[PDB]
Specification:
CATH topology of the largest domain: Cathepsin D, subunit A, domain 1
EC number: 3.4.23.22
Radius of gyration: 20 Å
Family: Belongs to the peptidase A1 family.
Bound molecules: ligand RDJ, sodium ion
Protein name: Endothiapepsin
CATH superfamily of the largest domain: Acid Proteases
Oligomer: monomer
Helix content: under 10%
GO molecular function, one term: aspartic-type endopeptidase activity
CATH class of the largest domain: Mainly Beta
Shape: globular
Number of domains: 2
Domain Peptidase A1: 17-328
CATH architecture of the largest domain: Beta Barrel
Length: 330
């Protein structure tokens, strides 16, 4: 089997991407944030505290003939940005892009934090990290990809995120029309539950490539590129007037600037992030200070290749016996 679904930016900045997901029978279509940095499939639901719902589409298990309570199971998750959600669990049929999993754990939110409520465009998350990170207790649950994987033609999914445009998530096959050149594969550590890999270095603009190991995660659920402070300082030093602002919470730059590209290594290959991808626009409406798309990881504890980096590539999440990660230019 395979599946193929279009993923669409939620706003003009590509802050996140939503992908339609069919849950239940008859189908209830929710727009979920596919997150390779977490492992819970959770949704706004008929159980979500009413004051915490503002415009989201909700899953109503009582209207699904295939929904069953996963008796006694609860979940609770905290993300890197400080957001959180929790609730109880149903099993139901879940389809993505024509690929169906029966008996998928669908984590129904009873509570969500303010950042979720305030985003009407995201109806929940679909985690694609390793199932070892799933928060369901007392019986940990599998991701959609791990429930799908044996059924797939190949044990892979691919992320093809657009810059200010829709893109694609494919399951079970690699679309050889979707990238240019060849795919470079690189090893993955599952030790922390993530698609954790080591980049071979970086360049700023037209500068020389610096060979250096940077261990980080491929995380579709993080907007920005978070790298060591040395690397980030080297990048922003090439932008007149850029500075780190503790009041704003990271590097800002004059909106009049033209940003340099950023290159990261994948083995002997190179992925180039155009400068425009690193522009996240005014810090507040009408401001002439703009927020940078490359930020320091020094206050995280991990480097994160988020959407800024991933959208510059065709990315293969190879879930073979020994998982790996492929990158191609596009
Ligand atoms: C195909 C998705 N599998 C899982 O989520 C299982 S947890 C897990 N931790 N390491 C692995 C192997 C891929 C090495 O798997
Ligand atoms: Na922000």
């Amino acid at each position: 089997s395979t599946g193929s679904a279009t993923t669409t930016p939620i706003d003009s900045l590509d802050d996140a991407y939503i992908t339609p997901v069919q849950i239940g029978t008859p189908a209830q279509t929710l727009n979920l944030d596919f997150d390779t940095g977490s492992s819970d499939l959770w949704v706004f639901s008929s159980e979500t505290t009413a004051s915490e719902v503002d415009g989201q589409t909700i899953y109503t298990p009582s209207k699904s003939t295939t929904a069953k309570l996963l008796s006694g199971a609860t979940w609770s998750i905290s993300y890197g940005d400080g957001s959180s959600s929790s609730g109880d669990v149903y099993t139901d049929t879940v389809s993505v892009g024509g690929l169906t999993v029966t008996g998928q754990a669908v984590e129904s939110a009873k509570k969500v934090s303010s950042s979720f409520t305030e985003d009407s465009t995201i109806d929940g998350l679909l985690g694609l990290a390793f199932s070892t990170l799933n928060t369901v207790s007392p019986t940990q649950q599998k991701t959609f990809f791990d429930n799908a994987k044996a059924s797939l033609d190949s044990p892979v999914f691919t992320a093809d995120l657009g810059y200010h445009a829709p893109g694609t998530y494919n399951f079970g096959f690699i679309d050889t029309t979707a990238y240019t050149g060849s795919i470079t594969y690189t090893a993955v550590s599952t030790k922390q539950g993530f698609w954790e890999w080591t980049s071979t270095g970086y360049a700023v603009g037209s500068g020389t490539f610096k060979s250096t190991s940077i261990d980080g995660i491929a995380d579709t659920g993080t907007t920005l590129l978070y790298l060591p402070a040395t690397v980030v300082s080297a990048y922003w030093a090439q932008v007149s007037g850029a500075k780190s602002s503790s009041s704003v919470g990271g590097y800002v730059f004059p909106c009049s600037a033209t940003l340099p590209s950023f290159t990261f290594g994948v083995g002997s290959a190179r992925i180039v992030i155009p400068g425009d991808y690193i522009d996240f626009g005014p810090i507040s409406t009408g401001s002439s200070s703009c927020f940078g798309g490359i930020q320091s990881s020094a206050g995280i504890g991990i480097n994160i290749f988020g959407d800024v980096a991933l959208k510059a590539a065709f990315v293969v999440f190879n879930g073979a016996t020994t998982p790996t990660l492929g990158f191609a230019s596009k």
